[PDB]
Amino acid sequence: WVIP
Amino acid sequence: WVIP
Amino acid sequence: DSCIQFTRHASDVLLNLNRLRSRDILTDVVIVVSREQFRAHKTVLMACSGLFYSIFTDQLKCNLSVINLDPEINPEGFCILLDFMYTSRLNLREGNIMAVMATAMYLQMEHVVDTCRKFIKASE
Amino acid sequence: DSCIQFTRHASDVLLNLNRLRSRDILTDVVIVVSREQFRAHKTVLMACSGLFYSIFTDQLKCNLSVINLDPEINPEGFCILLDFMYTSRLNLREGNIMAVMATAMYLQMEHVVDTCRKFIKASE
Ligand SMILES: O=C1Cc2cc(Nc3nc(Cl)ncc3F)ccc2N1
Numbered sequence: 001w002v003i004p
Numbered sequence: 005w006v007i008p
Numbered sequence: 009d010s011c012i013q014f015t016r017h018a019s020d021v022l023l024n025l026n027r028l029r030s031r032d033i034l035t036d037v038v039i040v041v042s043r044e045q046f047r048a049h050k051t052v053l054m055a056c057s058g059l060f061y062s063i064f065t066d067q068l069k070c071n072l073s074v075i076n077l078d079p080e081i082n083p084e085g086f087c088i089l090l091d092f093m094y095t096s097r098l099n100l101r102e103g104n105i106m107a108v109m110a111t112a113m114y115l116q117m118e119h120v121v122d123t124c125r126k127f128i129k130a131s132e
Numbered sequence: 133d134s135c136i137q138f139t140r141h142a143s144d145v146l147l148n149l150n151r152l153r154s155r156d157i158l159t160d161v162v163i164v165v166s167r168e169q170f171r172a173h174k175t176v177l178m179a180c181s182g183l184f185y186s187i188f189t190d191q192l193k194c195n196l197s198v199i200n201l202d203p204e205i206n207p208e209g210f211c212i213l214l215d216f217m218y219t220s221r222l223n224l225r226e227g228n229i230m231a232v233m234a235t236a237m238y239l240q241m242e243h244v245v246d247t248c249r250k251f252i253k254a255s256e
Pocket residue numbers: 054055056057058059061116117118119148149151152
């Protein structure tokens with residue numbers, strides 16, 4: 001999961 | 005395009 | 009093999025599948041979550057959810073145009089997960105995390121269940 | 133928004149859509165390319181090809197279970213492009229590049245047309  |  | 013690969017292809021396919029959903033193009037099922045209705049593509053639901061994979065591989069249920077979910081399922085939680093299926097983006101907030109996690113456990117979306125557990129653990 | 137994003141989601145969705153195709157699950161169209169038949173999902177074809185997008189958004193054609201392509205289309209070229217749609221990998225070879233490029237121009241797959249033009253230019 002990432003900060004888009 | 006890339007070499008997978 | 010000796011194939012070449014287009015890096016952005018999968019993301020571009022998903023973006024177009026979400027544009028078809030927005031425009032109600034070739035949607036073939038309605039998911040009912042109490043008083044709310046959500047239109048979607050059976051194939052996208054099956055590709056994202058272990059519950060929908062089991063439903064639409066069943067010889068009788070594969071033919072249904074309407075699926076009613078358990079009344080304990082929160083429509084907002086379902087809406088957030090449906091958006092995730094079509095976009096890869098999860099709108100996870102302090103006010104919805106419990107409903108989102110409960111819905112993801114029901115739909116069998118293991119990667120979502122994993123991130124919810126981690127965010128809950130961080131708060132404790 | 134304040135969303136989080138699962139990097140591998142789109143690739144995982146496409147992989148599952150290819151597993152449904154392999155297992156002939158919920159395929160809803162047959163594409164006929166001379167003596168050969170290819171089963172696929174209309175939504176994946178529309179998401180990848182400008183020609184299929186135009187076909188399945190047409191009020192009469194959206195209801196067809198069989199689509200016949202132009203007889204000049206090479207079945208091997210089509211097979212390579214169908215595999216690309218479901219996998220992002222293009223099996224481009226000196227012996228098939230002309231058929232693949234001609235099929236991609238017909239199907240309106242601009243990114244494939246672009247890589248074929250570049251590989252052809254490199255050979256000259
Ligand atoms: O957490 C999850 C997400 C998920 C999706 C699927 N989907 C499919 N699985 C296979 Cl093997 N082939 C085709 C499919 F559409 C099954 C189980 C699970 N569990």
